[PDB]
Each structure stands twice: as C-alpha cells, then as structure tokens.
Design a protein around this ligand. Structure first.
Ligand SMILES: *[C@@H]1O[C@H](CO)[C@@H](O)[C@H](O)[C@H]1NC(C)=O
Ligand SMILES: [Ca+2]
Ligand SMILES: [Ca+2]
Lengths: 123, 100
C-alpha cells in the first residue's frame, strides 16, 4: 500500500522504488534506506551513514559501539525482553501483552550441522 | 436432563513483575495455555487481585491494571508512578453441563 492505495510491483517515483525483485520485496528510498523483506520471516534495513547516532529502535543506535549503549536506559542495564518491549507501540484501540521469558533450552547442535556448515569452507 | 455445574478455579501467579520501564505483569490466557495452566475455553467471570496484598481490592490500589474475562490481566510499569507494578494474580470460573 502506497499512501493508502494498492500498487502493482514495481512502483517507481522520484527517489523511491519498490519491487518484487528476486525472492523478496525491496523498497529503496534513495539517500534514505534500503528495505528487503522476503515476505515471510526476514527483513533487512540498510541505512545511510548520515543517520549515525540519530536513530533508535530494535536496530539500535547506529553509533558504532555494540556492547555499551543499546541496553542501558537511565544508566540501568536491561535485557532483550526489556529492550524489545521499550520500543513498543500499540494500535489505537489495541493492548498487546508482553511475551513472557521462554524456559531453558535443549537440543543444541548435536549432529554438528550448524558447526559443519557455518564453520565450513563456504564461509 | 442436563444442568449446568459451575465452580471457581484456583489462583494463578505465573510471573513476577520486573523492575524498570518495560516491566510489569502480563498474565494472559495464551501464556496460561503455553505454561501448562489449565484454561477453560468458556467462562462467565474472572477475578484479579494483588498476590502480596490479598485484602485491599484493585480499585483501592489505584494503579493502572486492565483485567478482563476475554484476555486476562496486564499491569505495565511505565503507566504508574513510581513506574512499577505489584505482583498480581487471577482466577477464572469454569462451568460445564452434567446430566441430571
Ligand atoms: C553519539 O551520541 C551520544 C549520545 O548523547 C553522544 O554523547 C555522542 O557525542 C555522539 N557521538 C557521535 C560521534 O555522534
Ligand atoms: Ca550502540
Ligand atoms: Ca504474576
């Protein structure tokens, strides 16, 4: 939907172009952003360098320091559940809950498939 | 013959609210189903309360809690001053139909 109207891919205008390119739907706004969306799970944002330090969201602060500035709100270090819940936004008439922590893990990489592939020659 | 037989449930405190801004208590029927707590598909009324203060009612607390028969109970830290919640729990009412 572009400004409330359905459009047929690709839709192109000055600065903006949206396409069914490849396996995804890609929205590129020139000098602003690149948004890839496979349509089922993945979704990837490329941002200009000029938005360094001026962004905030699940994608982080874009200041370049990974381990010190994302999860420290009012000097208190917080957790992925907390960080993902701070960046929340309900609908006008919606009260979505907060998902509760999942219990401990199991399985692990028994057959080594993740270690066989990820650590394999391909990468 | 068939007559409705109905009764209350027990108390369900499946979470301990977390200090901070995004914290609080989120006691939802879907979470109750996931955690293994028995959730009746059909109900008539449910009752919420604070687990640590089992006398003074919800409105006497004055905190912002939404507690409804279709969803459950939710208290968010950021909506209250101080930005915190109490440790709440709730119970539900289950009614079936038994032959006379
Ligand atoms: C990044 O943002 C922090 C937040 O206040 C600021 O203190 C710092 O000077 C900024 N640095 C750059 C390089 O933008
Ligand atoms: Ca950072
Ligand atoms: Ca609780």
């Amino acid at each position: 939907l572009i400004n409330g109207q359905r459009e047929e891919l690709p839709y192109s205008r000055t600065g903006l172009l949206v396409e069914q390119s490849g396996d995804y739907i890609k929205v590129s706004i020139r000098l602003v952003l690149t948004f890839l969306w496979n349509g089922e799970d993945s979704a990837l944002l490329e941002l200009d360098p000029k938005y360094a330090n001026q962004t905030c969201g699940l994608c982080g602060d874009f200041n370049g320091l990974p381990a010190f500035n994302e999860f420290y709100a009012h000097n208190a270090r917080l957790t992925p559940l907390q960080f993902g819940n701070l960046q929340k936004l309900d609908g006008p008439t919606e009260q979505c809950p907060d998902p509760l922590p999942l219990p401990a893990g199991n399985c692990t990489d028994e057959e080594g498939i993740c270690h066989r592939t990820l650590l394999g020659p391909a990468f | 013959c068939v007559r409705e037989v109905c009764r209350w449930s027990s108390w369900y405190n499946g979470h301990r609210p977390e200090p901070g801004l995004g914290g609080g208590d989120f006691e939802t029927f879907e979470n109750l189903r996931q955690r293994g707590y028995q959730v009746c598909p059909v109900l008539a009324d449910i009752e919420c309360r604070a687990a640590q203060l089992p006398d003074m009612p919800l409105e006497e607390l004055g905190q912002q809690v939404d507690c409804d028969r279709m969803r459950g109970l939710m208290c968010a830290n950021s909506q209250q001053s101080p930005p915190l919640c109490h440790d709440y729990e709730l119970r539900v009412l289950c009614c079936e139909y038994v032959p006379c």
